[PDB]
Scaffold this active site. Structure first.
Site, PDB file in Angstrom:
ATOM      1  N   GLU A   1       0.831  -1.203   0.000  1.00 19.87           N
ATOM      2  CA  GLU A   1       0.000   0.000   0.000  1.00 19.87           C
ATOM      3  C   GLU A   1       0.869   1.258   0.000  1.00 19.87           C
ATOM      4  O   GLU A   1       1.803   1.382   0.774  1.00 19.87           O
ATOM      5  CB  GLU A   1      -0.951   0.013   1.202  1.00 19.87           C
ATOM      6  CG  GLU A   1      -1.784  -1.279   1.352  1.00 19.87           C
ATOM      7  CD  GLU A   1      -2.611  -1.324   2.643  1.00 19.87           C
ATOM      8  OE1 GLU A   1      -2.343  -0.515   3.540  1.00 19.87           O
ATOM      9  OE2 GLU A   1      -3.503  -2.198   2.772  1.00 19.87           O
TER      10      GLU A   1
ATOM     11  N   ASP B   1      -0.873  14.793  15.946  1.00 15.46           N
ATOM     12  CA  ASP B   1       0.071  15.311  16.969  1.00 15.46           C
ATOM     13  C   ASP B   1       1.267  14.357  17.304  1.00 15.46           C
ATOM     14  O   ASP B   1       1.252  13.629  18.297  1.00 15.46           O
ATOM     15  CB  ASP B   1      -0.714  15.769  18.242  1.00 15.46           C
ATOM     16  CG  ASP B   1       0.140  16.597  19.218  1.00 15.46           C
ATOM     17  OD1 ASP B   1      -0.415  17.479  19.904  1.00 15.46           O
ATOM     18  OD2 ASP B   1       1.370  16.374  19.307  1.00 15.46           O
TER      19      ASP B   1
END
Lengths: 248, 249
Positions: free
Chosen positions: B44, B55
């Site tokens: 992928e 974050d």
């Protein structure tokens, strides 16, 4: 009225992110009820709708747990009715959860329930048009997202008509080095400043009271996400607030 | 021709994700050229279009790095044309990248470059209509995601008419307690099986190797994400490679 975020802090804004429903809705509830006595000025409410994908990480796991708890937008909405806070509340949700509730309906509930802005990760400016119509009509800011990798002229296009505040994404690894990587960040604050007078809140990479005191010298606010969510891993509000208190 | 995935693996599929351009494009290039000798059957390919709002995360860092390093879909398409591999190539991108390129333009390009499927995180089924139209049109599968918790009737509806493979997410928190959550998965697999014949691959959370040798008896394939990306943080293709064969023994 349309939100002025400069009203929610004095020197520099403490911004936090949490996943609602993690580890349970009643924890979120109690948390929101104590928001008034935390140092958080602005709270981004993370609302889970689908499970995350190729991952395994802090924010992603809380979100799946929140899902199993039977937590969804409706219970969130319901909870928001029960809460009283003076702090600013800001939704952070994927577009899929808005699309499925209905755009106008969603913006209307959010507004009715004290939400003053939306951040919609991964919804680009070019795709934001209809959601923009609706936010404007109901006086809700759809947050414009900028990065240190965003080129200057795109910054200008993006901030010209922005409302609420500018979400600025930092790096921790463009150079590997840090002396330099902060100066790179300072410059981008400076570009932004000359296209909007909106306050600028900086997030990504901010992990403890040392990264906050630092990040404080850079813009108008500091956003702590993943480190906040880690705190809820515990089972005891008193301690969660003390951690948050340290971090800030 | 619509790809039959069962043609890409023998017993179980080793599936991996990487971020193109991390820590630089040349390492992604040298990686791809060596894909034929790695034990990965289907790769992928994460791109980056707009910087991840996250974050601190492994994958986001990779994407900022790709982005400031100047890696956009254009240079990826340019890279895919210089690559020769026999393994299956699958895009995993957010819809914003696709939208920006133009839906048709994107899908045709992807197909001319040997990409056989797209996974679009956070594109719900209901939003998919226009992308699906282009995927049918060029014989590219738009890959369907299901969880352990997705309602039986919602699963029948998502999979009865799907293409490629079913992407079964794994849960960590229906109990959070381990070897139970295993058997639950085998339940969900059985359920999907009774609605479709397509291969079922489980991803999310997989980290170690005996951690993959167990998922191997759950379905038809296994998808390593975060962890593979963590291999790429080395300044060394042979090390990246060695660690990716530690994972798939």
């Amino acid at each position: 009225a349309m939100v002025d975020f400069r009203k929610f802090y004095k020197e520099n804004a403490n911004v936090a992110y949490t996943v609602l429903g993690y580890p349970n809705l009643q924890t979120s509830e109690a948390f929101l009820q104590r928001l008034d006595q935390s140092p958080i000025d602005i709270l981004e409410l993370g609302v889970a709708y689908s499970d995350p994908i190729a991952d395994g990480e802090i924010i992603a796991d809380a979100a799946k747990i929140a899902l199993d708890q039977g937590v969804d937008i409706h219970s969130v909405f319901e909870l928001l009715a029960r809460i009283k806070t003076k702090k600013a509340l800001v939704f952070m949700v994927y577009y899929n959860l808005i699309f499925s509730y209905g755009l106008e309906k969603f913006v209307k509930k959010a507004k009715s329930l004290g939400i003053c802005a939306l951040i919609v990760p991964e919804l680009s400016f070019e795709e934001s048009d209809d959601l923009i119509k609706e936010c404007e009509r109901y006086n809700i800011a759809l947050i414009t997202l900028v990065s240190v990798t965003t080129p200057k002229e795109r910054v200008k296009k993006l901030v010209k008509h922005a409302k609420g505040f500018i979400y600025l994404l930092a790096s921790i690894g463009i150079t590997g080095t840090k002396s330099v990587e902060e100066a790179i960040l300072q410059d981008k604050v400076k570009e932004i400043r000359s296209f909007t007078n909106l306050p600028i809140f900086v997030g990504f990479g901010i992990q403890n009271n040392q990264d906050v005191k630092r990040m404080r010298k850079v813009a108008d606010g500091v956003i702590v996400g993943t480190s906040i969510v880690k705190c809820f891993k515990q089972g005891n509000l008193d301690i969660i607030m003390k951690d948050i208190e340290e971090i800030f």
